[PDB]
Amino acid sequence: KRYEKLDFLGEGATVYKARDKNTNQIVAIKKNRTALREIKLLQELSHPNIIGLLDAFGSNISLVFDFMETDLEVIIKDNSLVLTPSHIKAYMLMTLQGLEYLHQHRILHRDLKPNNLLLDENGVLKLADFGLAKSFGDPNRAYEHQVVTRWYRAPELLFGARMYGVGVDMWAVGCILAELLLRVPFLPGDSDLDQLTRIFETLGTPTEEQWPDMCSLPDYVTFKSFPGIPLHHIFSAAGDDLLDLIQGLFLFNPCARITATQALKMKYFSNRPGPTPGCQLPRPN
Ligand SMILES: CC(C)c1cnn2c(NCc3ccccc3)cc(NC[C@H]3CCNC[C@@H]3O)nc12
């Protein structure tokens, strides 16, 4: 009644474009117990790189956010675009500044993947779809457990961990970074077992030194030994500063794995070339 419905945008939920009658501004309208958890976590937060919940109303519920023009998946899949090292540095910087904020507020995203990083027409990247986000402390049930799509999913979750932390988001950011570099999914498992296969044959089956607790995980099972592939072989364009960020994000021990803040202090972010101005980031038609 306050927002002029315009164009359909998705079905998961159900999203629509709309024009607010008061300000005339363009927004996106998204239309349960976790529905309130979502509004709870979001009405709180304010960060340029986190989508901004502008309004809500009941009677299925309707979340009003700012319109976004595109997302990393679209960009990644757009052959017309060539991503430069500066482009990639920019996307990551914004992604990690948003994730550092979330984590400082003891929140896990738990569903980080390229289509959940949205971009506005000024090249501001924003984390979105907090339908799985939870406060760090909240417990994980066995049969209600919500887990990212398997290609971005961290090894501890594939081994059925119920106690976990930021490393689950940091792994997903590693898989996103790899996808920006290769322009295809990094680790495209065709099953949860095959997702681990792929992880180990790419990165090496973990030693006990690399991952002390691994064997005590609930769904731990014995895979063959794979040596893995050197990252400079996988990512042949990447400088040494980037290689070290990647390696940091893909450490098997979830407690050794690099945090958003540790990532952000990495030489990579202070080295030339600098991150593209948002207004210069590549745009699809
Ligand atoms: C609900 C809010 C976060 C939002 C703002 N703009 N916008 C657009 N904009 C158009 C668009 C087209 C292509 C790629 C991305 C966005 C599409 C869209 N689609 C719904 C889901 C789809 C899966 N990824 C998260 C999206 O919010 N949701 C939204």
From Swiss-Prot:
Active-site annotation: 111 (proton acceptor)
Keyword Nucleotide-binding: yes
Modified sites of kind Phosphoserine: 138
Molecular function in Gene Ontology: ATP binding; ATP-dependent activity, acting on DNA; cyclin-dependent protein serine/threonine kinase activity; protein kinase activity; protein serine kinase activity; protein serine/threonine kinase activity; RNA polymerase II CTD heptapeptide repeat kinase activity; RNA polymerase II CTD heptapeptide repeat S5 kinase activity
Record comment: activity regulation: Inactivated by phosphorylation. Repressed by roscovitine (seliciclib, CYC202), R547 (Ro-4584820) and SNS-032 (BMS-387032). The association of p53/TP53 to the CAK complex in response to DNA damage reduces kinase activity toward CDK2 and RNA polymerase II repetitive C-terminal domain (CTD), thus stopping cell cycle progression. The inactivation by roscovitine promotes caspase-mediated apoptosis in leukemic cells. Specifically inactivated by THZ1.
Entry's EC annotation: 2.7.11.22, 2.7.11.23
Catalyzed reactions per annotation: L-seryl-[protein] + ATP = O-phospho-L-seryl-[protein] + ADP + H(+); L-threonyl-[protein] + ATP = O-phospho-L-threonyl-[protein] + ADP + H(+); [DNA-directed RNA polymerase] + ATP = phospho-[DNA-directed RNA polymerase] + ADP + H(+)
Tissue: Ubiquitous.
Modified residues (Phosphothreonine): 144
InterPro entries: CDK, CDK7, Kinase-like_dom_sf, Prot_kinase_dom, Protein_kinase_ATP_BS, Ser/Thr_kinase_AS
Induction line: Repressed by DNA-bound peptides.
Pfam families in alphabetical order: Pkinase
Keyword Lipoprotein: no
Principal EC category: transferase
GO cellular component, one term: nucleoplasm
Coiled-coil annotated spans: none
All copies of domain Protein kinase, residue ranges: 3-269
GO biological process, one term: transcription by RNA polymerase II
Protein localization: Nucleus; Cytoplasm; Cytoplasm, Perinuclear region
Record's keyword terms, sorted: Acetylation, ATP-binding, Cell cycle, Cell division, Cytoplasm, DNA damage, DNA repair, Kinase, Nucleotide-binding, Nucleus, Phosphoprotein, Serine/threonine-protein kinase, Transcription, Transcription regulation, Transferase
Superkingdom as given in the UniProt entry: Eukaryota
PANTHER family hit by this protein: CELL DIVISION PROTEIN KINASE, CYCLIN-DEPENDENT KINASE 7
Biological role: Serine/threonine kinase involved in cell cycle control and in RNA polymerase II-mediated RNA transcription. Cyclin-dependent kinases (CDKs) are activated by the binding to a cyclin and mediate the progression through the cell cycle. Each different complex controls a specific transition between 2 subsequent phases in the cell cycle. Required for both activation and complex formation of CDK1/cyclin-B during G2-M transition, and for activation of CDK2/cyclins during G1-S transition (but not complex formation). CDK7 is the catalytic subunit of the CDK-activating kinase (CAK) complex.
Protein name: Cyclin-dependent kinase 7
Organism: Homo sapiens (Human)
